Structure 1
């Protein structure tokens, strides 16, 4: 039938999903095969890669404008029918169209709202949108990003924000932030074959060096920005450090902890994803919010191809690291995440633990099913990477489907950029 129930097996709440009937693009799954643990399951875009014909772009534009005007209790109004014919002539005469300030804000907010993988979405409508569509150079991108960071950091009282550079036009004039996130630490391939800093960014850190960045070759070296405007070669910019809020990691009991010389930055800011609205593609749209403690303390510190400080922390803890069954990783993991939370909170840097976040997300689910007929959600990603079953989401059935507007992954620019 035309309904799909999700059940929470810890509370027996059953929600009834009709919103999935609006899903537009494929999840990757078939009746015969589920792909819910595939990181990039589908390539079902809504258009061909480079500027699409009218009969391609306009149907997507019409659908979005239709949604925007429906959202605001119009549809068929004078302004809706005018906007349609304005988008028509704009596509006719430029092969694209330009979003209104209102529609741009609506779209950004809803792409966040539709981010199935985001546990933080209860905040979705409280997003600050910086319109950077007038930007024309990497210097201008740098100014816009600096302001983003300064506004978003707000001295630790972090604030959600997105800065939207111009939409893709022909595909050779992309605006891109080459950094995956606005603030990452460098990773250094060492002579022996080990790795100093953040191993995830070894490749990006080398592009930076290979572009003239002079690496301090330390553990927590903030990477420069590598900004690409209107398709041109990317340019390095050093973020003013007074804008990169950093928290030294200490522990509320293990005083030897701060002597591990660990710190992390306060602002998570995804800068390599693509924001899609009415078939328009915003290839540079850095968006930031605030950390769930597990992202630093479980993934950034404890993944094997990341900082991998589990080994160290357990040593100092005097744990039996002979076998796995002492749970020495699990014990050290918990202590590390206590430290991360405690440090952020002591410095009044906005952070949320995985209990509070997951609980917020269940509330948001309820809110969404009540007012929207559903809420797309990716269990594989919503469930935090430690203490899964002692959080409310583990026991929460989630329907996952693709609504638009949305954030999409996109090739890393260096796989695609022909240099000049």
Structure 2
């Protein structure tokens, strides 16, 4: 049947009819659920291309029109002639927005219709890739008034290497392996930091050293590019009432610009299509700064707050985490950099689910990722049953290029 989906806070029931159109298989079976796991031929391409073109023409209310038929014939004729095809720019924009819309782990999808799409499919060199990336960062950052954007580099094609951005985000802090095995800076980025050093980057020795970009043009080794510091907007973290918090020297960057995912549209694959929006504050204050395998600053802050750190039942961890999240929100607002707290974001996502139920009959959503990492059940999404499935166009994980 269609899954029955309940909201336990309100008692409201929906049926996800959209899931019946799920393209690819996920990791679960009737025997066991793997929903919590982080990492789950012209005929085939033409089949995906036709489904996408049909999708697009349905969305603009032109199904079965002459333009629809003409576009299908164009795609068939191009695949027959070349083994691949080119998206019209309107289709690329639609495809990128749909891939965002379809992303089950994105709580920010209320924004999905508002996406600046930079068409870099004419890109030829890593140097030009860098210029596109800087223009993206400048546009999206917008002096702190963040604007969602994606830059689409040339698609994958047979007999030619991919464009790749080796960095997982356009802005990443270095992580330096110390002699005793610990990390200075961001442990998430030890591997890319060492790759940057291997390719000729002179490392810093700070906790928040912005990494250079490793940009790979087809069939070339990656090339190192330094981001101009004026392009990388950062927010020093301070707290509204804990005056010592600023002295901790914590900071984060304004622009979450994810650069290692593959964008798939109509069977075409764009291995370099960095996209950016703005942060939800728990990403910074809870995960990046408090994860034990990231900056792991929770106990430092708890020491500064004079909390009792050797009984768990004092909830010192929870109190310290809240004040770090408060500091993130306060600091981005003070700096006039767009940020959304986890209450506002989850409330907007509930509105999104409602919109999508009416628009498409459901919404693929990954509960474990949508529910924020603090205050889970204080947010409405905790009480919302969700159905997780894969629709295309999509953003996919892909192997690291090295």
TM interval, shorter chain, is over 0.9
Is 1:314 matched up with 2:289?
no
Partner of 1:31: 30
- Alignment match, 1:295: 283
- Determine helix, strand or coil for the equivalent of 2:167: coil
Asked if 1:187 corresponds to 2:186, the answer is no
1:249 and 2:237 correspond:
yes
Who is 1:375 aligned against? 363
Query: Normalised by the size of structure 2, how large is the TM-score?
Result: 0.98
Per the alignment, residue 46 of structure 2 pairs with 58
Query: Post-superposition shift, 1:17?
Result: 1.6
Partner of 2:401: 413
Change in 2 beyond 3 A, CA 1:309/1:335: same
For structure 1, the residue ranges without an aligned partner over 5 or more in a row are: 42-52, 415-420
**1:210 & 1:248 partners in 2: Cα distance?**
30
4+ long deviations beyond 6 Å: none
How far the C-alpha of 1:89 sits from its partner, in A, is: 1.7
Task: Note the 1:101-250 alignment, pairs <5 A.
Answer: 101-170=89-158, 172-250=160-238
Contact 1:15 1:366 in 2 (8 A): no
Determine the C-alpha separation between the residues in 2 that align with 1:189 and 1:27. 36
Name the TM-score, length of structure 1 as normaliser: 0.94
Partner of 1:11: 10
Distance 1:40 1:341 in 2: 30
Counterpart of 1:381 in 2: which secondary structure? helix
Distance in 2 between residues matched to 1:272 and 1:20, nearest whole Å = 27
Mean Cα deviation higher: 187-196 or 268-277: 187-196
Give unmatched runs, 5+ long, in structure 2. Answer: none
Kindly indicate whether residue 274 of structure 2 is the aligned counterpart of residue 286 of structure 1.
yes
Aligned partners of 1:300 and 1:170: how far apart in 2?
Answer: 38
Distance in 1 between residues matched to 2:91 and 2:219, nearest whole Å? 25
Residue 237 of structure 1 and its aligned partner are, at CA, apart by 0.4
Tell me the equivalent position of 1:90.
Answer: 78
Query: Which whole-Å deviations, capped at 9, do the CAs of 1:141-161 have from their partners, x for residues lacking one?
Result: 100000000000000000000
Query: How far apart are residue 76 of structure 1 and its match?
Result: 2.1
Alpha-carbon distance between aligned partners in 2 of 1:22 and 1:233, rounded to the nearest angstrom: 40
CA–CA distance in structure 2, aligned partners of residues 65 and 193 of structure 1: 52
Q: Does 1:265 align with 2:253?
A: yes
CA deviation after TM superposition for structure 1 residue 322, in Å: 1.5
- Structure 2 distance, partners of 1:391, 1:337, is 15
1:148-184 Cα distance to aligned partner (Å, 9 max, x none): 0000000000000000000011275101110000101
Two-structure CA RMSD over aligned residues (Å):
1.0
